Ligand binder design. Structure first.
Ligand SMILES: CCCCCCCCCCCCCC(=O)O
Ligand code: NI
Length: 134
């Protein structure tokens, strides 16, 4: 299909709200939170055959996940959590669910009014990061 085509490309952060709150919720220490809060990472979304790849590149930490929609995969997050993940795409919302230690967090990407909105949710901690395509 072509459902993912609109997401493919290079995206740069233009705005962020409550990232600190989301990070601390995850157990990320103060020193790391300051450094992470200063960065403007670039996420690169790409497709190869049936497999999607999502790279996050910054002057601080770099990560990369590869997955097929609806298929579980192992992931080591930037804050070093070893999680089991699953990514699905429904109604144009790319939903990434991470599960570890009996708890979970979601990372949701949607294209709205010319921006990519990434909503990060861990319990009542909800962060919104805004990206724009290059
Ligand atoms: C670049 C973030 C450095 C600090 C690592 C904190 C890890 C929090 C989970 C990953 C958050 C990534 C959000 C995003 O892609 O913009
Ligand atoms: Ni296409």
């Amino acid at each position: 299909s072509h459902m993912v085509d609109a997401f493919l490309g290079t995206w740069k952060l233009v705005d962020s709200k409550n990232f600190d709150d989301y990070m601390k919720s995850l157990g990320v220490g103060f020193a790391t939170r300051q450094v992470a809060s200063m960065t403007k990472p670039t996420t690169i979304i790409e497709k190869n055959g049936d497999i999607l790849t999502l790279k996050t590149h910054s002057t601080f930490k770099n990560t990369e996940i590869s997955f097929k929609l609806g298929v579980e995969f192992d992931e080591t997050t930037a804050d070093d959590r070893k999680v089991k993940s699953i990514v699905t795409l429904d109604g144009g919302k790319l939903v990434h669910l991470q599960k570890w230690d009996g708890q979970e967090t979601t990372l949701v990407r949607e294209l709205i009014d010319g921006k990519l909105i990434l909503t990060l949710t861990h319990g009542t901690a909800v962060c919104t990061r805004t990206y724009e395509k290059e």
